Amino acid sequence: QYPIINFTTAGATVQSYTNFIRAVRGRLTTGADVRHEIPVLPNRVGLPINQRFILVELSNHAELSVTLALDVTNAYVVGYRAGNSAYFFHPDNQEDAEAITHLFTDVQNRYTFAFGGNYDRLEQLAGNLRENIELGNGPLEEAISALYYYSTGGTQLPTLARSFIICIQMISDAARFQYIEGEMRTRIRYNRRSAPDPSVITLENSWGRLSTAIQESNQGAFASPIQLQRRNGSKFSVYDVSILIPIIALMVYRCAPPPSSQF
Amino acid sequence: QYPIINFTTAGATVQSYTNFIRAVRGRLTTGADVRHEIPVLPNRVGLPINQRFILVELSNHAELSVTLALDVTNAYVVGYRAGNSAYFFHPDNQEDAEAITHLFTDVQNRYTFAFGGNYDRLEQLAGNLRENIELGNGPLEEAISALYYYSTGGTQLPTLARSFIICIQMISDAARFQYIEGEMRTRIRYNRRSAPDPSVITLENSWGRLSTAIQESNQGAFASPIQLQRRNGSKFSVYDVSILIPIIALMVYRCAPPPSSQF
């Protein structure tokens, strides 16, 4: 009953991936809430459970499928289903633990991992940092297979963690940032796989802080700058929402918008 | 040979005034230079004399006409012609004095006033502040007649100065600020005459500072806020170009734009 968006790595093109990410954004955010031209995800406070999640059904050339569940309030992957088994990251709190009972409700085998699905924890489990995990259509094809075979013993934990890291960046971070979507489109267009450069990593790491700075800004002006990195690792200072309009596609809700207060 | 734009107070409507101000902006600025969506006037440095001025020919229901000359670099009224006489405000420097010799070149009687055409000086001569000089179609009709009769002794100096104050705000300031154009459209729509409120005056006074703050901003963010006033005289702080996009229509050139420096 939650909305489902389908994507396959089989014969993926720039256009099919673009259509997919556009659909995911459409199901994450409603259009109610736009601050300086940038959409905001729904506020978790008071959000009915029937509106809390979306499902991303991923297929690959190997004819395998898995379904990821994303929380609309922050675009996080909270768990996944493959066949008759579902797995959820360790919940942050009791409300989240209750919420995930509403996902994959007829699956025969439900498991909750003891570990969370944040980047730091997943990198520790993978034995590799994001800067050393290749992304692209081949990585995603492989990730889907690894998730699919987990329940039968074919996938070691570090490979499972790597596979989550790939899915999260190629789906959640691409949905959060047009810039990251653009980086994945380029990989698909040239069928190349490559680890994310510092511009990608620093955006991933800064999403919450950027969301807050934009929402709490004075007419778009940040009280304090945010340091990002360029592709070559050099510093890029962000002082204003304006420079981020081509870059960030949606924000986590961090405060209510101030009154319009137009001149 | 300089471009001429015509306007008449006779049967003026919101649409005829809108057309006029749009034309004036079109002849002031070329489109070369836009910073944060706001056009900039040409830089005075290196600007050829054949591109330096525009002419605004004003007529009224009394069947009188005068021609104002505006400097494209700052939208200032520098002088005017009525029939066989022309009058220029006292030039700021030698280059400006030479420049005005290229205006109204066949007029039989040329005069340069000893006083400048800035608001402070004109208010002193008028014996009234802007806050006590009514604007609207009636004031402008009257101003055109007063300018027209100056050379024949019919217009006292304080009335001449008042008449300049009306023309400058209704033409130059309306061209500089959509907000001020909007205030003059309202006066025309309801055929009411009324002095400018504090929102109008503070914008007029702040045009140079706003131009500089926008041009020198960090991605649109001002280093220091600018205080304006609302219609009721209360303070309104400006921290960013964004809030000014509906308000200011063109800027005086204050610096070269920094490199694009997109992420």
Q: What is the DSSP string of chain B?
A: ---EEEEESTT--HHHHHHHHHHHHHHH--SS-EETTEEBPPPSTT--GGGSEEEEEEE-TTS-EEEEEEETTT--EEEEEETTEEEEPPPSSHHHHHHHTTSSTT-SEEEE-SS--SHHHHHHHHTS-GGGS-BSHHHHHHHHHHHHTGGGT-S-HHHHHHHHHHHIIIIIIHHH-HHHHHHHHHHHHTT--BPPPHHHHHHHHHHHHHHHHHHTSBTTEEEEEEEEE-TTS-EEEEEEGGGGTTT---B---SPPPP----
CA-CA distance, A148 to B229, in Å (whole number)? 64
The CB density around residue B156, as the number of other CB atoms within 10 Å, is 11
CA neighbor of A28 nearest in space, from A17, A19, A40: A40
DSSP A40: B
Cα–chain-centroid distance for residue A143? 15
- Per-residue tokens: B70: 């505006």
Phi, psi of A214 (to 5 degrees): -65, -45
Distances (CA, A) of A203 to A71, A91, A227: 20, 24, 10
The answer to whether B91 faces chain A, any CB pair under 8 Å, is: no
Report chain B residues whose CB lies below 8 A from the CB of A37. none
DSSP A89: P
Give the three-state DSSP class for A226. strand
CA neighbor of B7 nearest in space, from B27, B24, B28, B29: B24
Q: Domains in chain A, please, with CATH?
A: 1-175 (3.40.420.10), 176-263 (4.10.470.10)
CA-CA distance, B19 to B6, in Å (whole number)? 10
CA-CA distance, B157 to B64, in Å (whole number)? 19
Burial A217-232 (b: 16+ CB within 10 A, else e): bbbbbbeeebebbeee
Cα of A100 to nearest chain B Cα, Å? 37
Query: Cα–Cα–Cα angle for B163, B165, B166, nearest 5°?
Result: 65
CA-CA distance, B164 to B133, in Å (whole number)? 11
Say if the Cβ atoms of B240 and A218 lie within 8 Å. Answer: yes
CA-CA distance, A9 to A139, in Å (whole number)? 10
The CB density around residue B174, as the number of other CB atoms within 10 Å, is 26
CA neighbor of A18 nearest in space, from A5, A2, A36: A5
DSSP A255: S
Question: β-strand A53-59 against A221-229: which pairing, if any?
Answer: unpaired
Long-range contacts of B92-97 (CB under 8 A, 24+ apart): B92/B116
B48: which residues sit within 8 A by CB, 6+ positions away?
none
- Which site among B238, B242, B245, B261 would you substitute to test the A interface, given the most A Cβ atoms closer than 10 Å to its Cβ? B242
- Which site among A35, A199, A200, A219 would you substitute to test the B interface, given the most B Cβ atoms closer than 10 Å to its Cβ? A219
Question: β-strand A109-112 against A85-88: which pairing, if any?
Answer: parallel
Distances (CA, A) of B170 to A96, A213, A224, B6, B64: 61, 40, 40, 14, 18
CA neighbor of A47 nearest in space, from A74, A23, A77, A79: A74
CA neighbor of A83 nearest in space, from A149, A7, A140: A149
Give the three-state DSSP class for A58. strand
- A72 burial class (0-12, 13-18, 19+ CB within 10 angstroms)? buried
CA neighbor of B253 nearest in space, from B215, B218, B227: B215
- Per-residue tokens: B41: 């006037």
Cα of A184 to nearest chain B Cα, Å? 17
CA neighbor of B161 nearest in space, from B130, B185, B131: B130
Give the CB-side neighbour count of residue B124, counting CA atoms within 13 A.
6
CA neighbor of B207 nearest in space, from B249, B162, B237: B249
The answer to whether B234 faces chain A, any CB pair under 8 Å, is: no
CA neighbor of B164 nearest in space, from B113, B207, B99: B113
Cα dihedral A234, A238, A239, A244 in deg (nearest 10): 150
Helix (H) or strand (E) holding A225: strand A221-229
**Torsion sign across C-alpha atoms A101, A107, A112, A116:** negative
Q: Any idea which residue has 């889907």 for tokens?
A: A144
- Per-residue tokens: B208: 């140079």
Give the three-state DSSP class for A80. strand
What is the Cα gyration radius of chain B? 18
The CB density around residue B90, as the number of other CB atoms within 10 Å, is 14
Cα of A61 to nearest chain B Cα, Å? 35
CA-CA distance, A249 to A35, in Å (whole number)? 11
The length of chain B, given as a count of residues: 263
First to last CA, chain A: 45
CA-CA distance, A184 to B255, in Å (whole number)? 39
CB B254 within 8 A of CB B216: yes
Q: At B48, which amino acid appears? A: P
The answer to whether A227 faces chain B, any CB pair under 8 Å, is: no
CB A157 within 8 A of CB A228: no
CA-CA distance, A82 to A59, in Å (whole number)? 11
